[PDB]
Tab-separated table of C-alpha atoms in Angstrom:
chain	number	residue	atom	x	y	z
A	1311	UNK	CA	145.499	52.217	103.047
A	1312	UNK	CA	148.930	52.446	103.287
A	1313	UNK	CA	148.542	55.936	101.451
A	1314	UNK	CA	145.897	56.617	104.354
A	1315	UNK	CA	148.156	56.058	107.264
A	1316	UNK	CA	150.532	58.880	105.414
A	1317	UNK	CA	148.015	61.125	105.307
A	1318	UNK	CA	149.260	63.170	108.598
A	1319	UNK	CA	147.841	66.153	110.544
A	1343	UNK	CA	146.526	82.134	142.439
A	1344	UNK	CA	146.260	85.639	140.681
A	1345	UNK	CA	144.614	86.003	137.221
A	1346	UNK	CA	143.768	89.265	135.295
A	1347	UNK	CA	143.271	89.231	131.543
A	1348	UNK	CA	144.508	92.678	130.004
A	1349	UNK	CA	142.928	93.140	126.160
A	1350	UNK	CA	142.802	89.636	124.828
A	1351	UNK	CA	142.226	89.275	121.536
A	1352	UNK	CA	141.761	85.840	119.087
A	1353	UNK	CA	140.366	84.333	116.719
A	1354	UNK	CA	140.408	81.173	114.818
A	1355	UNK	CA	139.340	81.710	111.665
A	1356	UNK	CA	140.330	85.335	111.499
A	1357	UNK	CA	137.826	86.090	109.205
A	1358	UNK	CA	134.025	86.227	110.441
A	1359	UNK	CA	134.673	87.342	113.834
A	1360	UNK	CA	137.369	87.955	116.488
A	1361	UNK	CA	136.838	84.959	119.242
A	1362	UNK	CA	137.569	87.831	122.073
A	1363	UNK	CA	137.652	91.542	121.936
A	1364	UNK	CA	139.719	93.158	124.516
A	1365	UNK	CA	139.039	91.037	127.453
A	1366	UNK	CA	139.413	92.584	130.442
A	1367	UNK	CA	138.940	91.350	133.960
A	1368	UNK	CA	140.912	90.411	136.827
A	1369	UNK	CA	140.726	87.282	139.419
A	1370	UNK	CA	142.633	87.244	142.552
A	1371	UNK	CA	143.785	84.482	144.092
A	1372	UNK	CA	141.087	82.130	146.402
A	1373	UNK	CA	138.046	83.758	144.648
A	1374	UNK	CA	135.624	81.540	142.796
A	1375	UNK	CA	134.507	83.024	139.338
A	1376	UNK	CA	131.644	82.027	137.412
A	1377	UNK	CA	131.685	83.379	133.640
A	1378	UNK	CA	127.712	84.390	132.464
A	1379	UNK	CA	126.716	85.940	129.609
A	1380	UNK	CA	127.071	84.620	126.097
A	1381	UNK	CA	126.197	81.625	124.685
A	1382	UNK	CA	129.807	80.868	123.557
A	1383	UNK	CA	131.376	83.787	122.077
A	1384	UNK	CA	133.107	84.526	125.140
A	1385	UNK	CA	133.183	81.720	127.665
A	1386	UNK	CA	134.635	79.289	125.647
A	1387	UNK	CA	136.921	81.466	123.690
A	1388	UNK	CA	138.041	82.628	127.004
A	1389	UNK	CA	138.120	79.095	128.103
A	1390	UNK	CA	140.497	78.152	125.844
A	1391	UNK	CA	142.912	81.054	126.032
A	1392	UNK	CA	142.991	79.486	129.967
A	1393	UNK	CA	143.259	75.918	128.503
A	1394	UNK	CA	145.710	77.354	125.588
A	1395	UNK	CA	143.806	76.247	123.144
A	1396	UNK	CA	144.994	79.466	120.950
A	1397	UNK	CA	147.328	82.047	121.614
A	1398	UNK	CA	146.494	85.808	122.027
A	1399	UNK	CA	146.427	87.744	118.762
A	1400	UNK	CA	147.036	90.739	120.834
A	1401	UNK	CA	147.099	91.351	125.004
A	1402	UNK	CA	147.961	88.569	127.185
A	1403	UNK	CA	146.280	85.646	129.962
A	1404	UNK	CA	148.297	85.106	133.307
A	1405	UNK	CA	147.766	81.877	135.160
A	1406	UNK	CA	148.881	82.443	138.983
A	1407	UNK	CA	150.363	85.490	138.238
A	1408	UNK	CA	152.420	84.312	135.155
A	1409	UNK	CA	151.738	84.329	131.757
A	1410	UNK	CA	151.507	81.363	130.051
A	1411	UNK	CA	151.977	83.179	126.018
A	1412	UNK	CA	155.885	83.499	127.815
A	1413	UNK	CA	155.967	80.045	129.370
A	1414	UNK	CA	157.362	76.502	127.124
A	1415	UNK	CA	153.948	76.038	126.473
A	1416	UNK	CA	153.762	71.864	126.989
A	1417	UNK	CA	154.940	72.227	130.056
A	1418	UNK	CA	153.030	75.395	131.388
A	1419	UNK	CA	149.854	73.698	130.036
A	1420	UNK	CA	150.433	70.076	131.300
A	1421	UNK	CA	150.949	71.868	135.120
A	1422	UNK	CA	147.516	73.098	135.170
A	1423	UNK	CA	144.401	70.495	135.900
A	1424	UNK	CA	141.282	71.647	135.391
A	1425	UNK	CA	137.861	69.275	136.329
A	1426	UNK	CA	134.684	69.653	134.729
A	1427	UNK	CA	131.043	68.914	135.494
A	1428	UNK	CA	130.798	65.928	132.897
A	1429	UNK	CA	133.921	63.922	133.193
A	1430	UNK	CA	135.209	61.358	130.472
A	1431	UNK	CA	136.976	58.960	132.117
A	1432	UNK	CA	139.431	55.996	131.302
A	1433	UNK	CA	138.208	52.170	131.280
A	1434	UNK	CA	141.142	51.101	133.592
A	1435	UNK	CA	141.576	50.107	137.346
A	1436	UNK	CA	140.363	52.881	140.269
A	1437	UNK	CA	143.978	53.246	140.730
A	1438	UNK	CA	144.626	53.613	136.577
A	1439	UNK	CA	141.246	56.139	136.497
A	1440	UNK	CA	143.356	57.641	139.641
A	1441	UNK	CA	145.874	57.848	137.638
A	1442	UNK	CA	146.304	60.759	135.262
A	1443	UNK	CA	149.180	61.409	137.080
A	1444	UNK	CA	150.919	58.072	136.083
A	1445	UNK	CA	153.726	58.827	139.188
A	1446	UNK	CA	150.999	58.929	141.786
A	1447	UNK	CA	151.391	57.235	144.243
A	1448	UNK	CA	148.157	55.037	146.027
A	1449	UNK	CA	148.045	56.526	149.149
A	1450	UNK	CA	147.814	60.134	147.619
A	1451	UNK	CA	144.804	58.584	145.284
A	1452	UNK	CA	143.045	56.792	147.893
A	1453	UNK	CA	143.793	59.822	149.889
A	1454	UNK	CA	142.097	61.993	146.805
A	1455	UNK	CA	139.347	59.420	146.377
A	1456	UNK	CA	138.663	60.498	150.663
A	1457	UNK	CA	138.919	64.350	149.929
A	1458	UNK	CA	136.258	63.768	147.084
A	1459	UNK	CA	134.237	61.664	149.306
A	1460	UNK	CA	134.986	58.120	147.338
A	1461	UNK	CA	137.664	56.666	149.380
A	1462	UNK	CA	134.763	54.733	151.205
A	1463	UNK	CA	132.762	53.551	148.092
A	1464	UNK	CA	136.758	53.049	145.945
A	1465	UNK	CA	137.669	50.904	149.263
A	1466	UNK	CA	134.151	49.430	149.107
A	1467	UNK	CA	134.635	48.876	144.984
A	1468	UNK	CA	135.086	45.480	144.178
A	1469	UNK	CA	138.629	45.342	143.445
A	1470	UNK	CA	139.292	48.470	145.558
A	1471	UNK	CA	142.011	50.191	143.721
A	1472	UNK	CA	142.259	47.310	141.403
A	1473	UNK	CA	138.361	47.340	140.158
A	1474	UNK	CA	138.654	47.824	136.732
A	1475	UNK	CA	135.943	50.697	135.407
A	1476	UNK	CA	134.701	48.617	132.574
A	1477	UNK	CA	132.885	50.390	129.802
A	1478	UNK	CA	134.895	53.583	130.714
A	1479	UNK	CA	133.416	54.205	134.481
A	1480	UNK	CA	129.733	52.988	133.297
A	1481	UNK	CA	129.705	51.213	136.671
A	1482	UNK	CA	130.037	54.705	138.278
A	1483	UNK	CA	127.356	56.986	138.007
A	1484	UNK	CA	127.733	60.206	136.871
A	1485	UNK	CA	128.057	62.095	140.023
A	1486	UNK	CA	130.432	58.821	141.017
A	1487	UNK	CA	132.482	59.818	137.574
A	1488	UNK	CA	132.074	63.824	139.132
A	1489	UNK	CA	133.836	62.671	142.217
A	1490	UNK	CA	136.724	60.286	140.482
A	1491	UNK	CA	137.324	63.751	138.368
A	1492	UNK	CA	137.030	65.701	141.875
A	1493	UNK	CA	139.701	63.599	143.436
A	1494	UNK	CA	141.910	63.733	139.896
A	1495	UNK	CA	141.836	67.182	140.455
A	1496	UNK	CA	142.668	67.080	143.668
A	1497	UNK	CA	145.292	64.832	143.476
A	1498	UNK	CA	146.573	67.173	140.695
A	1499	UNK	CA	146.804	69.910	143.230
A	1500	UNK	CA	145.943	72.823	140.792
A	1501	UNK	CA	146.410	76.504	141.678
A	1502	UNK	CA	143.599	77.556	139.687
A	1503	UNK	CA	140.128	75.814	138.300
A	1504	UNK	CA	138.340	75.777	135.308
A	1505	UNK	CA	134.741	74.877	134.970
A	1506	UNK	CA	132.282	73.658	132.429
A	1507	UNK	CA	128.753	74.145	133.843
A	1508	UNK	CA	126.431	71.170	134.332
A	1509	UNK	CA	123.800	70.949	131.307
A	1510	UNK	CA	121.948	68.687	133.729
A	1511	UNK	CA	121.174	68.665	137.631
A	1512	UNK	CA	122.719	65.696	139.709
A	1513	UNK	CA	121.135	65.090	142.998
A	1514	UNK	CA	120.205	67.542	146.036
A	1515	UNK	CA	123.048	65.982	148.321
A	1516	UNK	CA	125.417	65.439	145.010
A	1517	UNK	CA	124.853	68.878	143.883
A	1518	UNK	CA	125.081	70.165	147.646
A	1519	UNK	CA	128.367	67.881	148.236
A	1520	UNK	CA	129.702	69.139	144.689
A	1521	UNK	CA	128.857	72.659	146.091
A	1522	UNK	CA	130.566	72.040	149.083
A	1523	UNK	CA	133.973	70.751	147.735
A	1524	UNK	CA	133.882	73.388	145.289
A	1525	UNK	CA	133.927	75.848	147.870
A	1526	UNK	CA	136.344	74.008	149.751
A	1527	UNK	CA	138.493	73.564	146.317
A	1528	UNK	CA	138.498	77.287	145.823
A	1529	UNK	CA	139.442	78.105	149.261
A	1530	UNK	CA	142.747	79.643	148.374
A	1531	UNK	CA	142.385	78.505	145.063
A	1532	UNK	CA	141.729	80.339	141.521
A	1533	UNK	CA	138.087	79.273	140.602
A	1534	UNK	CA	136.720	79.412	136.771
A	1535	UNK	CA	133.332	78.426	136.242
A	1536	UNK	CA	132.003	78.832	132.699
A	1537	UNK	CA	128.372	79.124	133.595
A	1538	UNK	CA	125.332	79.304	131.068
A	1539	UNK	CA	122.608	79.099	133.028
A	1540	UNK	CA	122.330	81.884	136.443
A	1541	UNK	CA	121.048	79.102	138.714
A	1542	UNK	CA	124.967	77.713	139.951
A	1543	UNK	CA	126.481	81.088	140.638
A	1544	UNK	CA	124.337	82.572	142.472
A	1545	UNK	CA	126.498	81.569	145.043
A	1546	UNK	CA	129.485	81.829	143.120
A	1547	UNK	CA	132.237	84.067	144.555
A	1548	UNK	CA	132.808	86.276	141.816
A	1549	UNK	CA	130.943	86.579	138.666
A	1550	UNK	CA	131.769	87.951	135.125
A	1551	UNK	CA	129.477	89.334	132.962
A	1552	UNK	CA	130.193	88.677	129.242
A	1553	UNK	CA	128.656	90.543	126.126
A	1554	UNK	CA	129.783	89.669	122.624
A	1555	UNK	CA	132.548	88.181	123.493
A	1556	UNK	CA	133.739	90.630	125.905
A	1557	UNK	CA	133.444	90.942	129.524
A	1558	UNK	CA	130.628	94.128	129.835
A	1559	UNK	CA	130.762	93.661	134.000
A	1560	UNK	CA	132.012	92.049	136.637
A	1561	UNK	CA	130.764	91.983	140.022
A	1562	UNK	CA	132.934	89.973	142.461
A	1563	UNK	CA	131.200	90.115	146.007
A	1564	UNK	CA	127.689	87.700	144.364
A	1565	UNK	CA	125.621	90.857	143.465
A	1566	UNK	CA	124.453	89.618	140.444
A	1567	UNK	CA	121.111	91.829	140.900
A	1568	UNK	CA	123.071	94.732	141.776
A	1569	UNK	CA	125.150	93.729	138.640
A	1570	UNK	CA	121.884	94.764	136.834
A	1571	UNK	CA	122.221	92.090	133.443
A	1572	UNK	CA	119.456	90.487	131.865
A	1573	UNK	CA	120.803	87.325	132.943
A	1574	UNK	CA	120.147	88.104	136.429
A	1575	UNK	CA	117.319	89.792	135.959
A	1576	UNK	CA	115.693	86.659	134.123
A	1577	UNK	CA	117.056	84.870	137.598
């Protein structure tokens, strides 16, 4: 046992990324190229995984470059302290994990917040009313992780996490699974109010989210093969739009 516990382990543009993992069976990207400017909302289509989520990670640095580099807001994060360049940027999903603590400690992954800038989150995602109107308030404790939350509930908690975060720039795992009409619209709705000014990633599988999306990049192989910005995803002319 004993032996066990010893046993230890807003402006973006991408200019010819390259990495891999394993090194061996296949580069993760292959001279990425594509640029973001600041306030536009991108959506990532095309591969399953061989781009979006190697790209992803580059954004999350997950893995540096092997060659070329990724600039977050206009600076690179490859020439950054990396901890603290990576720890600056928050990023909210679709499916959000979330912490069985208080509404306050679930509005707090930002341990110095303060509770007027989380209830003030909770009313920018739309919450503030049902967190005020949670049993404890602030103080309810999300037993079972947030299981008394629904998922859309645990959408907005990550929402107002984000936006008490404050981010300069997004990224975005897309929904495997649909919400609600007015969740989905309201989602819709602070997303476009969230990328207002704000750098927007969406890593999209399906076509059916960004057909509204601001901008969207077209990935092949793990490479970016197009990218059409102003949503002209049929005049883009891939076979992911032209299954939509």
């Amino acid at each position: 046992a004993v032996k066990r516990i010893h046993a230890l382990l807003g402006k973006i543009q991408i200019q010819n990324l390259s990495v891999r993992y394993d090194s061996s069976l296949k580069p993760v990207l292959k001279h990425v190229n594509t640029l973001i400017s600041p306030g536009q909302k991108i959506g990532i289509c095309g591969r399953t995984g061989s781009g979006k989520s190697s790209f992803s990670l580059a954004f999350f640095r997950m893995v540096d470059m092997f060659e070329g580099r990724i600039i977050i807001d206009g600076i690179d994060i490859a020439k950054l302290p990396l901890h603290t360049l990576r720890s600056r940027l928050s990023i909210i999903l679709q499916d959000p994990v979330l912490f069985s603590g208080t509404i306050r400690f679930n509005l707090d992954p930002e341990k110095k917040c303060s509770d007027s800038t989380l209830w003030e989150a909770l009313e920018i995602a739309q919450l503030k009313l049902v967190v005020k109107a949670l049993p404890g308030g602030l103080d309810a404790i999300i037993t079972e992780g947030g299981e008394n939350f629904s998922q859309g509930q645990r959408q907005l908690f990550c929402l107002a996490r984000a936006f008490v975060r404050k981010t300069s720039i997004f990224i975005m795992d897309e929904a495997t699974a649909s919400i609600d009409m007015a969740t989905e619209n309201i989602l819709q709705k602070v997303v476009m109010t969230a990328f207002a000014d704000r750098t927007v990633v969406t890593i999209a599988h399906r076509v059916h989210t960004i057909l509204s999306a601001d901008l969207v990049m077209v990935l092949k192989r793990g490479a970016i093969l197009e990218f059409d910005k102003p949503e002209t995803l049929l005049s883009q002319k891939d076979s992911v739009f032209a299954s939509f």
